[PDB]
RNA sequence: GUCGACGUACUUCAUAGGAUCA
RNA sequence: CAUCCAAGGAAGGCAGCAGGCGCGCAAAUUACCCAAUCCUAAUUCAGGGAGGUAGUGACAAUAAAUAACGAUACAGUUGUAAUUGGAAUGAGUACAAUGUAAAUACCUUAACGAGGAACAAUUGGAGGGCAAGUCUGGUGCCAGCAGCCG
RNA sequence: UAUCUGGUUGAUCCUGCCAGUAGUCAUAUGCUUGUCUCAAAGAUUAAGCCAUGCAUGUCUAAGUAUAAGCAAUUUAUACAGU
């Protein structure tokens, strides 16, 4: 979401703290392969990030 | 090589260092409360309502 | 932790309007902070004192 | 409140940008500027390189 | 003021009715110096037309009111649109306003002579600390508004 | 809910203009031969 | 245990435990106002310059 | 100590010759 | 070297499988199972981080999508289409079945899934052109630098 | 090295020279990363130090059961199933 996002440009602009990624509400996927695809997806944009 | 950096100075006291902050930031309804709401259980072993 | 100093009789004399003094508790971080008073500190969203 | 005063003449601020944002610029800052649209002598006050 | 190489953010608008879906990071940067003054100045050129033309001499029109504003121009460095580089020579008595110059080469009466001069702009000194805190709601502090925002309220 | 648009999705940044013949090999190949005999033809 | 005094009264009266109440120490620098000289540019997934 | 010798690593200078034409 | 301690004592060896430190700068899961391979026992049956299964940075390798067939339009029989017609299909979603120790996936397959097919292919290199714009130099109007700024 | 490009003058050929262009593999790193099959995971010459969990147990009709164990019973007053 944008706040997530402004959240990191704001924190890398100011001194960049230890940043942890939490994903939450992964059992409301109804299926094993796209939850899959959704955190390896949601994990490399992370990454860019931090 | 990688582990050369620029040389800086940590003041962070050698005896009884002030706690660490941890800030549980995201969106509305993400579930900040109640990961700290779990932590803390499991830190402390109470849950604080 | 946030609390009030001021007398409640100067509240009620002068009325809400008046300027209220404050006592502000908790852990010190990053650099020592000098010990006589007149430091000149930032409270975000308030202004300096 | 003290804090509400402040408040009162930043207002009063806030109008006159406003208002000095809207209006029309000076002649000085139209970019091209021909005898006519500019005061007669306006240069004659003012310091141009 | 702050030292030197302290980096900040900038945005444009913090209160949760005017947040939108667009991104609300404006501005990204670098303090490089502080000082009490700063010498910021703007192009403005003086736009005329010639009338009379001699080869390289030539009489030109509209650059200014009165013998008074071509007095200081004298020497002044001006060219055509084309780029022919011409000087404000000598004020004619009669007409006011109206001045010789000379040119490298011959101009058309179609030109139009322009001369470069700098005016000089300052920074206004505004200052809206942002205090959240003491407001009830918090969330919606505001301050001036941008130059859009008021165009689209008074219509 | 304000989720993150396109451009910060693939975050494409600053690319260049690339036309489309670019995405299918193929498709490239087969234009650059029939363009090639099409100058056999005037050799 | 710090004292502030002359605290805005909106501070007390609109105190929401929620929202952090962050301190920070000023420098001398800090202290004055002038001109700022910086390098700036517009953020890249910013819309409008 | 702008020290000597050695070892090591580099920089640099020495490329035009014959035939035709004007 | 190092853990507990009531200070009297007690307990240590991941160059096993996971996972940490060694920096202030970084990289597989503290996952499921003995179903296959074989091993141990008093033994067909219990055990096996040996081993297998799945997850995870493009290690090294194989195959291979991102469009195909036409009409119209415009321009110097060639090129260009945010033009246009109805046919094809998997990336993905998903009843089901198969798969598996149980699962995921593969192979199958009802029903969805295409014009900007935005269901939005990348990494490098070369060469331009534009201004009432900016800088430098001088056998006039030029040349060089360059030009997100007029 | 080869091939190709360019420079060697007032110009064009013929020589010669000079500069750049070859390679997989290895290390580190950058950008991108849709499908099928398949597969590996060292390294500071630091065999340097390890929180936590697991990684070695094993019973057939056929060595020893009055478990005050379970369930079956008069198939069993020596026992007899598990
Ligand atoms: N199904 C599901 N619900 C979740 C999950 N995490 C949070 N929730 C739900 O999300 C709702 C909000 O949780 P909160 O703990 O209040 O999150 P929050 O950060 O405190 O939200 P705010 O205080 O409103 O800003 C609760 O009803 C949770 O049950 C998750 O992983 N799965
Ligand atoms: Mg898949
Ligand atoms: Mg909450
Ligand atoms: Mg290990
Ligand atoms: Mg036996
Ligand atoms: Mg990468
Ligand atoms: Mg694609
Ligand atoms: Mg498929
Ligand atoms: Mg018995």
Partial sequence: EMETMEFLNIAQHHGMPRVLGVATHLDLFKSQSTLRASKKRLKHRFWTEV | ERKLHVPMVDRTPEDDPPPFIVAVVGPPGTGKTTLIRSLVRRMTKSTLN | ?49 | SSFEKQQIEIRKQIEQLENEAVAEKKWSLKGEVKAKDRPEDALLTEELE | LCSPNTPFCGVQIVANSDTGNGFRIAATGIVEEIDVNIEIVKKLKLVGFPYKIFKNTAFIKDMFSSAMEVARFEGAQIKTVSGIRGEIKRALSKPEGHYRAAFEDKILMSDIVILRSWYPVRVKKFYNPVTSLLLKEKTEWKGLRLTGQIRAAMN | KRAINYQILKNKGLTPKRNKDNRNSRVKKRKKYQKAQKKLKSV | RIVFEKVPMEFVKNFNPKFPIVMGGLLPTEIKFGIVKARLRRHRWHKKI
Avoid: C, M, N, W
């Avoid at chain 3, 009030?4 to 300027?19: A, K, N, R, V, Y």
């Fill in chain 3, 1 to 49: 932790r946030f609390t009030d100093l001021t007398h409640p009789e100067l509240i009620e004399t002068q009325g809400l309007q008046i300027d209220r003094k404050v006592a502000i508790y908790g852990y010190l971080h990053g650099t020592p902070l000098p010990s006589a008073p007149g430091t000149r500190v930032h409270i975000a969203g308030v202004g300096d004192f």
